Amino acid sequence: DVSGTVCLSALPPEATDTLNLIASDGPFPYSQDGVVFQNRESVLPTQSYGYYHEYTVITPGARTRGTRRIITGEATQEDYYTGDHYATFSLIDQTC
Amino acid sequence: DVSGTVCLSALPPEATDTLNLIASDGPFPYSQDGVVFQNRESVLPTQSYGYYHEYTVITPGARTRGTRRIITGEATQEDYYTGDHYATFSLIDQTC
C-alpha cells in the first residue's frame, strides 16, 4: 500500500533535483539510475515488469547511494518517494 | 551545485599562483595540498573517490590555511574555486 501523499516541498531538496533529471531524461549521476524497479514485495500496485523505474535521490553526507529513491510509474505524475530503501512509499504531490 | 563560472583574472592573484603550482606538480606550500577531496556534502557533481583533489589558495596575512581553495577534477580544465571553506564553488575559466 502507498502510505499517503507527500508534498514535494516537504521532501529533502534533492528530491526536486531528481525529478528535474527525470523530466530531462538525465544525464543521471549513477549508472543504476533508471533501472527497472521490480516491486518484489508488491508494496506498489501490481503492474507488468518494466512499468516502474528507480532513480537515486542523493543523501548529502552518506558514503553510499543511500536509501532515498524516486520510483516512477507510467501514468502522468505517478512518482513515488521512498526514504527507507523501498520499505514504505508516498505519492509525491508536486503542487504543494 | 556550482555557482557559475568566473574568470581567473577576477579571482585573487593567489589563485593564479595555485594553478601554476598544480601545473608543475608543486612543490606546494602546505602539507595538505593535493589530498583527495571527498565531496561528502555533494556540492560538486558526483564522481568516484579520488576524482577531486584540494589545494590551498593562500590568504595574505593568515596564520592558518584560511578558507580559500582550488578543487581540481580529473577532466581537462575542471577546476573549482571556493572562498568560503567549501560552502560554495565557482568553476574557474583560465581563458579570461
Curated annotation (Swiss-Prot), chains A, B:
Query: Which cell locations does it reside in?
Result: Secreted
Where are the catalytic residues? E54, H85
Which CDD domains does the UniProt record give? RNase_Sa
Catalysed reactions, as listed in the record: [RNA] containing guanosine + H2O = an [RNA fragment]-3'-guanosine-3'-phosphate + a 5'-hydroxy-ribonucleotide-3'-[RNA fragment]
Please tell me one Gene Ontology term that the record gives under cellular component. Answer: extracellular region
Q: What is its EC number?
A: 4.6.1.24
Name by which UniProt lists this protein: Guanyl-specific ribonuclease Sa
